[PDB]
Amino acid sequence: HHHHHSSGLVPRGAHMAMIQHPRIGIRPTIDGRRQGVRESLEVQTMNMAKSVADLISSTLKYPDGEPVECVISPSTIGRVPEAAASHELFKKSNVCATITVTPCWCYGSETMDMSPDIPHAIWGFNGTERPGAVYLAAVLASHAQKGIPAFGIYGRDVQEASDTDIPEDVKEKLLRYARAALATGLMRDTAYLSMGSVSMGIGGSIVNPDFFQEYLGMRNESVDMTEFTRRMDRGIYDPEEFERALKWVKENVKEGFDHNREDLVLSREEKDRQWEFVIKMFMIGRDLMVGNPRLAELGFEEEAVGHHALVAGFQGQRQWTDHFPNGDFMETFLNTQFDWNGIRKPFVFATENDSLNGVSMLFNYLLTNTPQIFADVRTYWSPEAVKRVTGHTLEGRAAAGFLHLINSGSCTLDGTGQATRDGKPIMKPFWELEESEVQAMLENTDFPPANREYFRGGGFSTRFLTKGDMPVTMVRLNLLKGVGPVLQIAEGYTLELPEDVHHTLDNRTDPGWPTTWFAPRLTGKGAFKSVYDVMNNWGANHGAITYGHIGADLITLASMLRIPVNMHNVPEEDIFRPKNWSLFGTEDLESADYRACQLLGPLHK
Amino acid sequence: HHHHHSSGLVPRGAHMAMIQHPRIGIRPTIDGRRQGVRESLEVQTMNMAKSVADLISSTLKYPDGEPVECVISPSTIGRVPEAAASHELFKKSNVCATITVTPCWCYGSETMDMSPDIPHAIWGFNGTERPGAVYLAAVLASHAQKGIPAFGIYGRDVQEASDTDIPEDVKEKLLRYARAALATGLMRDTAYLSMGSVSMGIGGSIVNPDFFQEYLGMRNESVDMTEFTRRMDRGIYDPEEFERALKWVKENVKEGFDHNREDLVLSREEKDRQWEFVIKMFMIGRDLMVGNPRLAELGFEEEAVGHHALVAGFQGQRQWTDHFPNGDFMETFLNTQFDWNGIRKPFVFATENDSLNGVSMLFNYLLTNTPQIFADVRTYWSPEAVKRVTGHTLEGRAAAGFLHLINSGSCTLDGTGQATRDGKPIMKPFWELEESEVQAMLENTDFPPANREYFRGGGFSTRFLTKGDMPVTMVRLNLLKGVGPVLQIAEGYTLELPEDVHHTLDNRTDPGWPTTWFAPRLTGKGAFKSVYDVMNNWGANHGAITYGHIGADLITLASMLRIPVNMHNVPEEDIFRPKNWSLFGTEDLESADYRACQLLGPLHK
Amino acid sequence: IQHPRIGIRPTIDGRRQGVRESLEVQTMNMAKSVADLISSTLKYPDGEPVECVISPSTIGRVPEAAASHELFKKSNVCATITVTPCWCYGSETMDMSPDIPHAIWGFNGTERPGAVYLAAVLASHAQKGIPAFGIYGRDVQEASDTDIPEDVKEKLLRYARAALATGLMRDTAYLSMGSVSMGIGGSIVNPDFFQEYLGMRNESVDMTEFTRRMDRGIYDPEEFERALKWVKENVKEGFDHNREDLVLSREEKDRQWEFVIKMFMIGRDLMVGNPRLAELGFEEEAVGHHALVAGFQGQRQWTDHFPNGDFMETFLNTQFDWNGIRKPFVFATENDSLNGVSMLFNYLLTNTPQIFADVRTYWSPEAVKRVTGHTLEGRAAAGFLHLINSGSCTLDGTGQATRDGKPIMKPFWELEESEVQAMLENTDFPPANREYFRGGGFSTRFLTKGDMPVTMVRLNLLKGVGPVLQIAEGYTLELPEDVHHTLDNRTDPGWPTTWFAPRLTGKGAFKSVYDVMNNWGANHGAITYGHIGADLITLASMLRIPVNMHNVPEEDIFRPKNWSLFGTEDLESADYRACQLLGPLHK
């Protein structure tokens, strides 16, 4: 951001849209009594605060790889004017959530944080010498009596007064809380950009701004896809960048086998022209999302600013893709953690402008800092169907059947699963990626010409096979009329089928697109009695798939946003929600969660 | 109550506040058809009524030890004008709830009680000769169709027509119903008195009159604590009583070891002055609650009347206890079933003006006629922490860990557990206490000087150890914003630790205060999967602890008041709620209970 | 005293190569004029000029909106004003903050569609449920014109004063001393109301704290000596109406004077803290309770025993004492917290101290005739109300301060020495009536000068709905001297009097002066210098408190623009519907 010689802002340096740095505000509360008690507790109390700040700052990173930032109250908090001084610092410090720490008794409502629009957690030391726990429960009761949600963090094992380690059980809670709170703080005040609008009558592509505004704190931008054509015809993109990209693409991107029907096959001259075009789609999509200071230099100052988009979508079908090369290459590379410019954070991006899938990916992204697989839930494969079709009897993780996850053209190349840790397939934050790993991803992917019976305009799709045995979580938000957003979660594993089984199933389906074979973990409960039941209960044709088991993190996140969780396979002992959820019931956690979300409602209504 | 020579009422005889005598109204309904049927059923029907009245009156007592009173309709009820005559009698008879009894078919809505503001139960004889059961179900359907809650009492085993025993299964239901209904009738129209107001920002001490008014039928009174000072300086207490108390206290109350820091230790002259002062606090607190006719004789006629308080609280901290001796001695003796004047009903009394703990104690008190332990839930002791700290491996009832229950100074001396039945520790109604038992309680208690780093004004705390192996129920009401009161219940046992374990844990905590070691019964369900989970779900720093397993009684009570139960460990087969609860669902009893309480709402809104 | 800012957001057409660069200067000028108008005209309770912030650039596209929001977030902005002369891209340029008021001023000129933006962006505000005021001038202005027209200033300043009132309340506390006073409803303090509507916290101390600080020297002894001396010189003890055997000796009266001074000191220390207390070694007591407003329960338990609260209540609400001229500390008798908030509304809108009073009597013209022989004329002609607190009232409520030979109440920084003198000279302090206040003390007795324009205000809690506001603009009265003395002597001549006549309109509860009283929702009112009804209405609408009753002319009613979508005919109902649906700010 510098000021334009006459009018607006323009970017200089990095993009216009930076990743934000929300802080966590740490509030050490103390007994108010002086002439002995308070003075004797100051040091133990303020240390608790310092140790929490070091835990978070030394463990968690923002999407840009920087260490998360913490702020401590200007003093310990024993009486209201100390709370007010705290609140005043936090207001100007960009604080997205609060952690109160204490080893002693403090005065409930005199010391509590009143912010209704952010999460709070309280950690009471489990010690005998002072009532730390007792404050914990007291102040949480005030929170529930005043309808300001707060998390309760209480360690299992009595600690000695002089001990300053944070117990593993407390750490787990502190970090789950922090990861989830940071996701809320990173979404807030950003936008979703629609390119186009509704795609083929798909629910999530009918974008609902009330949801963004009320639940997420987010704005909605839109451009009609004509914008791409305008920029291409008028030279509103970086031509020097274009030349380097064309060269890198020629070197690194293998064009794939052409399955097109005979009379639909394009000339090699046409295919080359289409390659230039999709490279420009990428640059333009990326520029629209985040801005580009080069656009300003080329004298396109209005365009240089972008659309402040933390997440975005491309309608494509039907009107664009009937005419012009499709968006597979754009969608692929936006979601991939590199291009000709180098290794890079991803730009979270929805196929078919499925805004709800976009937000599902963004939850996943902000919780993990890892890129996100976008997929159609194409087929449920029962053991019986697999046996009939291939002769093979499924075993290990595939034994109970599995789901074919395969988007209609595009997918993050990180979703190959070629990055490695300890001999195992994973998806990594961009700053952990090695050159070899990028190379492996490119090497194990190719780019078949688009199927022109569906995508007359042409383009190239993305084709790889996700490596088996990677822990993942599939995720989907859906909008329920009269209720709002509801969240479903399925943790499980990618699979490696026998090769013949893979090729047989693949070739009957859509072998020009990207494949992940998915087995969800069954629990014998709810919708996880069988793999079939998991599909039959999946509430949209799309899912968002992340590396890792992040179910418990999502559940915590959803409660912060007051989004009820309709379906998950997370063990119950991992469910971690504000302490007042339990006033809405302890047996029927699902109903209590609906009652709590219903009553408190979204953050920004 | 006599009229003053010029103006008000004043008490004479007992106190101004008597314990009330709510009645149970018994309604025998009969088939309307004469010329045979009705006349042949009169005697069997009216006997059912008489036997129910004898059951209740011969088994249950009011808090003052008098036998509960019943009223029968002026005739059997076969047609509406007989129902009207019944309703007319009950209106002037102080009837707090209804029991309809019948051996035959009667005409539904023609015969039913329409009172919306009181509980109803219906007992249909399980006989073959007439449709008793059939009336039972019919009239209950009318109750649910008209939104007037009623309990259904149906015996398991077909009885012979000539049999007049009440089956054990029916008796259990009749008496649970009656105990709970009487508690509602005893609370109604009484008050809660606040002395002071908010204590150290504690939730329950921010008194919510909507709750008292709407749910309990109760008023709220308040005095600023200055009132104590006024009465002490102006001689507004009984000086003859004061002298007898001072003497009894010198003989019966052992002053305890002084743990104070050296420069804070008070002179013996000061300690003696403080003893006089806390004796006066007691008398004044007791007088404020219930009135005193002696105050009238001494010419303080306004004060003699009291505050009509069935339950009350003393703020204490911070402003009073920073200056004057604290309220431990007052709170202790109000909750204890004796003093210098003799053996006595308790006066239900909250530390720190925790009005919600007060009501929790009062539920417990009205259900049992036994005094009530007020406690901080200070510490969860895991087996691992106990092993580390003491070397001991916990066994029997303590094996899964336990809770340290220990109020910040005061507790009913009945909570020593020194009263005995059949070789076992219990807490008794006052009229069952023996002189030896009072003596045991005094003998096993002492009264340490208050800790002046917390209670600068001084005073004496109460110190004993509750005997192990007593069945108890811990209880807490909490206010949930947008919902109202919700009730949690944990039945279990007091523990006897090995002596070394006890002293080690005690001495690290607050050995000048009273201790109960508590193990809740685990069920493998909800919040009772582990002792840790029970604490982690306890919704305030306070609990109310009663002798006995009274979970099922509380659940019945809560349904009468439409307070949902968020957490309990009572077996499901014991849950006994109005029959329409089951129209709100039969599987998810917790959700159905929230839906039912939500829809019907409190009694007096 | 916080310094909440107003954020000025200059929005602009995003199209360059001409349009945008041509409008930059004129657009930025609108921002600058508004900042100047506000900063040169309004002041915080402490006398300092109000502060504004402008967006770091004009706003034509969303990332500029984002930057504006980033800056305002750290600049303590309590409300926004968008200004524009041109068309701009509605939802791309709008402020989304749900917890603060907004206003849009669109230039009324022809060359560019500024009124078009104004209405389009307000449509978005209504459709997204984020209330915003619309500010549109009556007369087409020339593109180069730089004057803010008078209709526009009036709206901008009304908006700003009301916005600032919300900004100054937020995050402060109400302190109760004691609890419930004599079963008075407003003294059963409701924290949900404070928390949800006002963004305020609740603090609490038992009156025992007073005794504690007195016994233990927890107040400033230098200050005490200077105060005792100043009070002997300046404060006139009044007539003792007590019956013979209740009359106190001169010694006892003198000890009580020392005590009530100490009460004043402790009350003030409790509200705002005092660094002298830390110097004297009570570091805890030194910080105070962060109270923008407070009350003192008093009766029954304290005033039965100890000197009453009148002196403390009077001087907290007065703009001076032995330490010099000074802002008031808004303070409620009987801990009537609703009256306290009513006073504070008036205070924050005007920077002038506030009369607390019981609405004691309605005097009909018939009854004045019967009792006095006199036939009321002038403003008094249609009857009137006796406003008189049970012992205390701000000395500024004498009406001794003067502007243009007319009685007023002034912000403290406009007070002259001679005016303080006049307030003192026209007040005496009668011993407390010991049948009602056994514990003693001294009340405050004066008579408010007549012909002073005032507004009486009351906030009431209505079960299941929440707070509702009632407003009566009117005038103080001067009665014939002998008529005054007859009415006074048979009521409570030891307490302070204001004679009030509300303006009648023949609408609603303002058809007669009796109707005004018959519809008054409590025994208390807060009374301010000035006719500020229109300001209250705007403030009420900011906080979503319905107005149940007011005598303000309909043309002056200025509410967020989406109120009109709830109805244009039946404004009262539309107001209730809007507040009901929108709810308090901090639910």
Ligand SMILES: C[C@H](O)[C@@H](O)[C@@H](O)[C@H](O)CO
């Ligand atoms: C080719 C088809 O139109 C395909 O694009 C759709 O089924 C789409 O994937 C649905 O999300």
Ligand SMILES: C[C@H](O)[C@@H](O)[C@@H](O)[C@H](O)CO
């Ligand atoms: C000594 C402490 O203030 C103690 O009184 C508190 O923790 C209190 O027991 C909380 O209920």
Ligand SMILES: C[C@H](O)[C@@H](O)[C@@H](O)[C@H](O)CO
């Ligand atoms: C003397 C009375 O108590 C008086 O104080 C009451 O009328 C009080 O003014 C009610 O506001």
Ligand SMILES: [Mn+2]
């Ligand atoms: Mn699809």
Ligand SMILES: [Mn+2]
């Ligand atoms: Mn306690």
Ligand SMILES: [Mn+2]
């Ligand atoms: Mn009054």
